[PDB]
Amino acid sequence: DAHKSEVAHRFKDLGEENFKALVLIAFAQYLQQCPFEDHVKLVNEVTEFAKTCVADESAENCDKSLHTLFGDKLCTVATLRETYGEMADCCAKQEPERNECFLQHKDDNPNLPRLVRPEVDVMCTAFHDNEETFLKKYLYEIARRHPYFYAPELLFFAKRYKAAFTECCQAADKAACLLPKLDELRDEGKASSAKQRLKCASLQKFGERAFKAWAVARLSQRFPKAEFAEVSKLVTDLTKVHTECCHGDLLECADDRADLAKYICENQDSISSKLKECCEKPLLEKSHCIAEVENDEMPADLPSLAADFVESKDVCKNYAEAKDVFLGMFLYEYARRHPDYSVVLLLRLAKTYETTLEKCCAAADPHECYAKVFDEFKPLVEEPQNLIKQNCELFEQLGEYKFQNALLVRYTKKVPQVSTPTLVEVSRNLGKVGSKCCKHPEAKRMPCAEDYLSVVLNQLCVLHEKTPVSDRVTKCCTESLVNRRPCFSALEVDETYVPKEFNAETFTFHADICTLSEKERQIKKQTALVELVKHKPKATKEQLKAVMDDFAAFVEKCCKADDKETCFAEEGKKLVAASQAALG
Template sequence: MKWVTFISFLFLASLAASKHLPRRYRHAGHQDTIAQATEVTPDEFRGIALVISSQALQQATYEEVSKVKNDIVELQKKCAADEKSDPECTKPLGTVFLDEICHEQEIIAKYGFADCCAKVDPERKDCILAHKNGTQGFIPPFQKPSAEEGCKAFEADPDQTMGRYVYEIARRYPFSKTSSIFAGARKYKEVLTTCCKEADKDACFAEKATEVSKYLRKEFARQKQICSVHRKLGEVPLQALKVALISQKFPKADFPTVLKLSADIVHAYTECCKGDTLECLLDRADVSKYVCSHQATLSSKVHDCCEKSLLEQGDCIAHSENDDKPADLSPTVREFIDNKEVCQHYADNHTLHQAKFVHEYGRRHPELSPELLVRLGKGYGDLLEKCCALENVVECLGHGEAELKKHISDTLEVVKKNCELHATAGDYLFQNELLVRYTKKAPQLTFDQLYEYTKGLTKAAAKCCHEDEAHKLPCAEKYVSFVLGEICREHEIHHINKQVCKCCGDSLTFRRECFSGLGPDPEYEPTPFASDLFTFHPDLCTADPEVLKRKKQKQLVDLIKHKPTITDEQLAGVIVDFQGMMTQCCEVADHKTCFETEGPKLIERTRTAFGES
């Protein structure tokens, strides 16, 4: 679908005169300046300056970055007091940040920015952004202080401690949103405030600081996934999903507004993905301001978000509940089915008509996932291609409507079956089932990778299967899409196989269906049998239960990699045989001798069952 085409068309045709257009659509002379940076508090502006400087000067020391940050803050104070006090006061904010970096001659010479600073914008800006490196390990791993040392530093100078924390995070994630780093810093400050009062500081930090790290890793992973999709598939799939999601979140919003917001949000993604995190921040702030100034026509659910600081509004709005459907909204979208004129609308602009369908269907069905809505939009387009070539258009569309409804019911049935399996099997056996499936699909992945991905899918089932019917499907598709996105990011770095490549590269919204349809990799050469492939140690009888579970899962994966075409019956037989050996050997005093005797017998029986002996 040519989403870029219709969004551009709609902006030119319908929104060009809007006084509410974001900054990039306004007159070129109207831009954010440092003198206007009063919409955030002084502390927030200092934080922004620190984040942007740390992300640009990744290899610089904290002291060097602080020098740049302090100069920017002082300039902002000066310009706020008198906009005519310095020529920098009326320059675009992004230009001022680059000017301040390039004024530091020693720093730019030391870290290789001299050539960039000799250029003029936009070449200067592009050059500096091109230096950003988000590769893991580019900045050495952070050496965490002990709990005691961290608390002493925090008590002595809270601002310095938090500043260093923000600096260390920002320089390692130069493409990440400022708001995510701020959110992580707020959470970490709460950890310091709480844990430094505890007698057992180490235990407190081990629990609470780990949660902050998990939060940040997931946030950054999600942002990297967006950039991966943007890099490989462009803005199209991201805009399509946003149209669906915003239609559900703001069902009162009219179609042009939904398109406007979706384009604005994806444009912010584009800026962050190319490393222009300041422009990304400003774009997101514009979206927040627009939403908060149009609450009456958009949503009654964002009031509390709009009471927060500008830096917190965006993420809060993104996670806000869907607004209630308008009372006068018709229950169905018959105008897209019972109307011959739809063919003319479709002929006039294919993608615009499909987008209207997604919008109208989405605002009526918050219980469906955005991914499913986009798939329905694609199905509706295919239906029009078929029916509009026939004489009995309405009759054909009526039959086709049943196909769209079947796709919805099929999707819900997949979720239902997986939830039933999870309810019956529990987390451990459910994950084992997923390990079998995904080892067959992608045997090139290591056990640790397969374990983490299937653990993520198991957590999705544990969380989403307990949701009510209004939230179950959106929850499931969201979390499953995240895990599949992580697999695709891994594939982008290290090629997995051709069938995974196809699923990752063809369609974002059909990705889950594609992965579900994969069988054993046809080009995979199974791991040859070796005597040490399956080893049975006495610690199988004495290991911690969780450790033992993982050991068994490792052997399960090794077995599938050796025999990816194994049938369910063969696998069940091997598992029963293995459990029997475990019971037998763990009941005798000499575990070691028993395993040495019975282990080879088990292997031989297994190979015979596989037709290998």
């Protein structure tokens, strides 16, 4: 593929709207400090040129590559040295040194102030009176604050925001319609950003063979009709894409992703029937659509796994030939038969098979050792399926909020060293995971759980590893991504914990609670419970339930009477002393 102008060629394939979006994101992930209206100029300056070249590729500078045009344009920026400093020094570099120089001088935390959400009225009003300026500003604002976030992915999110505004701004109780959707998108925004980063860290730390294992597992579930060769092909293609995107070049990453889809949509018949709609969709959309594609039908009359991977003298031979191609096959075969399983569960099986196979092989006669490998799998399978039942049962009894509280207590006792604000949010978000996935039938519970659990455990591990307080959490966090959730599951109640000293103000409450969002109210209620538990690790549901119900009664009482503030302090003082006796 070669065009005289690539800038002319890109302008057409993407379409001007997507084109004017990306360029804005592009120049916003670099030049995070420059004001909006400047970028808007720059965007338009590019966009004019882009059009000059669309009209005639022979036009001057149209021939020059995106990498050259983009770089030249960045060096055009006046006050580049005043604000961007060493980034300016990049301009004396000749491509591809200069482009690499730019990537290096991205700032992952520009110390920009928190992006504050206006009131619904203000947004809808601005949205109406100025749609583009409204939407682009925030696109700009998000892209500069998140310079490594994959630009197309950001764009897909921006078009969803537009949707929520368009629907909600027309209706009554817009805030009721809108605020949910805006949080939902934000939560997803973080999840996406974290999931992207988790893909790159895993590849760096645990390596590429690990990466591919995770990939084989996942694709074999996604594409059960495909042969091991074809999975294996796609796994090696997919890893390379990740390896280019983790470096952080957008164009290269995008081209690799586009290529990988191009291939997939040509060989649909070889992979999955579910690709048809995705492949019709436009290029940016196609890559996204493949990633999210439904699992294909698992072929019927599938042979038992105990034939090829047990009951076969050649296994010890074949394992040795290629430890990874055989193991990979086993994973492929096990996985395509188990879409109901979590990716990490399948790796625990493959890992087990390998450990068994290596130890068994070259010792005595192998058959007698490798005979019971499949039995070793059953305990591993049961453990995560047990937890789902136990948790989804308790969830259905208690309901989300109360479930979050059951969680809060449990975890505080295990890891009291963790900051209250972190204990709350993790316990809240875990509530949401069981809320979402317990609604699924027995199948798809684990794959649902895994993906949602990964984000929460990552949020915590990312947040904790900046300010560590627990060796037990650190161990889990810096452990293999296969063993990460089991480690957390394994955490036992720490007997060594010296309780938190009482403080009145913590357990003091004001009438402000009465008029407050339930979430905000819950957070503070929830906060007190954590503090309560940190004070009294030797508290027990029998004793704890009492105190929680008296607090339930203390709050409904004062918020009901006319002079709430007096009640709150005076009743609280009773509530404290009473409870303090009840827990000691």
